[PDB]
Design a protein around this nucleic acid. Sequence first.
DNA 1: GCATGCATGCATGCAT
DNA 2: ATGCATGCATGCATGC
Lengths: 343, 343, 7, 7
Amino acid sequence: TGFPLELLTRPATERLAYFENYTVAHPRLKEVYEILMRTIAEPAGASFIFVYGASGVGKTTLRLRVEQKLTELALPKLESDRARVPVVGIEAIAPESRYFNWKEYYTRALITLEEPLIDHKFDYGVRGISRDNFGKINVESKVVAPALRRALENALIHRHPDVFFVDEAQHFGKVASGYKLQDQLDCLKSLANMTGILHCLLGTYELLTFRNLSGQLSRRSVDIHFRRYCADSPEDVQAFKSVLLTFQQHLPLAETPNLVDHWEYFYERTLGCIGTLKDWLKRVLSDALDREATTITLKDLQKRALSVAQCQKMFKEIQEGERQLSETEADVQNLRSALGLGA
Amino acid sequence: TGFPLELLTRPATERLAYFENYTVAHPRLKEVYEILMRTIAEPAGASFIFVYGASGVGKTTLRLRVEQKLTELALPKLESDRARVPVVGIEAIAPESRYFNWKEYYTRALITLEEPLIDHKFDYGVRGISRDNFGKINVESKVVAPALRRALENALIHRHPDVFFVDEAQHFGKVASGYKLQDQLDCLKSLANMTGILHCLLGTYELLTFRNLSGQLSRRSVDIHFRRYCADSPEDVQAFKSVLLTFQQHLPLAETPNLVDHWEYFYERTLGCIGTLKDWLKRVLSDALDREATTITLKDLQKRALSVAQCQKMFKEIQEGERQLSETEADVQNLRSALGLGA
Amino acid sequence: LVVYEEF
Amino acid sequence: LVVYEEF
DNA sequence: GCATGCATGCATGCAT
DNA sequence: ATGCATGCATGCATGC
Ligand SMILES: Nc1ncnc2c1ncn2[C@@H]1O[C@H](COP(=O)(O)OP(=O)(O)NP(=O)(O)O)[C@@H](O)[C@H]1O
Ligand SMILES: Nc1ncnc2c1ncn2[C@@H]1O[C@H](COP(=O)(O)OP(=O)(O)NP(=O)(O)O)[C@@H](O)[C@H]1O
Ligand SMILES: [Mg+2]
Ligand SMILES: [Mg+2]
């Protein structure tokens, strides 16, 4: 339907913020959102939700939208269940050392489970954990890691969040010895088991090494592939063109530039990742607003585009991820033959 | 036009200082500065920006000028809010041991964020970090690196500076044997993602090791190349000659020496980077001023020129960087052939 | 082409 | 040959 | 060079 | 017056 026409009289900051707040519900995002919401609603023994995708595919935006929707849904019964918290969302920390630091992870997990009203959770742990007469839940450095884990699991049991979000889960792969990866993820698996809290792990394709560590681990996990648009299929090309048309209609400008004809260039330098296209269009629109230009030119798009080397690197990573994530009926027939009679 | 004529009666120190403070806005620096400011104004999700410039290119002066301009821009706004710092820039510390130290990096970054209006923040949220009560921020040696990182992240998110400048960023590559090179940048990516502050990395061509480490890093980084003035193109040679002419007209002597006639020698001993040319001209101007010479002679220039052995290594490193940083239409076709893009 | 609702 | 300006 | 957990010795607050 | 008990600071010991 296009942007509101009254934004033209508004300053450039208003138009820029409006374009920032705009979002597109393209079919892959909608399908992944519905699948994730359904899986969250009934974990059914699953201890992990591996949501992974192309760099630029908009995974974090999905996490934010899911958190907002779950909070909105929980508010009517949050009016009665004071102690509960609907969603807990934290970001994994890339460690400066060779191995992931679980102590900092536990500290930040406890910090995220912070309520300014103390009466909801008066006591959090054994000692050295309570707040310092402030909303911030300060933790003494001398508190040992297993005690911190115990306090975190007790807090998780008391609060009982619907889902625990760990954004950029690929940071868990920082370790020294090769087979230590199984222990690295088994720690989180035991945490989820005792806490009885479904964990959703989001990250890029670097976490595809996290897929099939063990039979128990593969059983406990659910895979949600955030597919990026691929030109090989005309349906994806049509969806990409529709998204480009929507972005063209919704960008605040005196006249709407024809971004559809340049879909070839856009895909090339975005690899079908909608988030990258949105960021690129945001950059170009900011450039135009600074210039107070009447329209977007191809020169403007080229000026703030991604380098060919960067796009090649992302494409190589995406190709490796999709190859690792591909399934064919031949594999199914092989599995059935291994089990027995196959049809 | 040129230098003020009244400086001739002034002592040698004043003329030397006037030439030291003089700067030239040559076209390459103008383009790089425009691109840098346009990216800084609207990062649009870019966690990193990379500025690859040769030795003597002028990256540090560029940082000082953009810092000054951004501070001037944000000065009128500081009346409304006094807790905002426009720009913070720190130099990367070369490690004494084999590993880049992140504890000292975090400590220096936190020190650089000190403000006389300490009452506005009044707390960093971590034990062991406080004000010295007179003019300093003192950090305890018992404060662990994750605690320092948490304090720095809280300070950054409170202050929200427009850009975090890291000069001599190639020191991050000073790491032990192994694939820790990717982790060195992953930690910074995680920090910038949490604080939401664009990190600008400036360094020589040794920074190319960080260029395309991973798909995510390549996507969320912007590559800015500070090209030197090449000798293979007439436009670059003419710009170099114009810069030489400006320096000739702006150096305070009784009679302006003819330097454009020796442009080949200047290019030979500077490889086109005008920062080295300015430094060498400052040296020769001081040498002439110590004896009150009326003009610059070829012998004076030769007495302080860089050794050819030095310039051979300079050119080897410059060629190594420029070969990697180059792109042609063949790369675009190769990318699109790999893609589903028919063209 | 298909218009897409805000998400 | 152009007398460039100051930065 | 730093991290991190654990043990010990000393200071101090309380109770008899 | 004072003895006891606990909390904290520091060394240390191994690992990275
Ligand atoms: N569906 C969408 N519609 C509109 N804009 C989007 C959408 N998805 C992503 N974006 C834009 O892209 C930005 C980045 O999205 P994000 O979810 O961080 O992508 P990513 O590929 O997961 N990035 P990373 O943090 O490196 O994993 C958002 O903040 C929006 O500006
Ligand atoms: N545009 C300019 N105009 C005038 N002088 C300049 C200019 N650029 C550089 N210089 C001079 O050259 C010096 C060195 O520039 P700098 O920005 O430190 O280059 P660099 O290659 O980043 N140095 P480093 O990498 O530390 O060896 C400056 O301090 C000035 O004296
Ligand atoms: Mg993301
Ligand atoms: Mg320099």
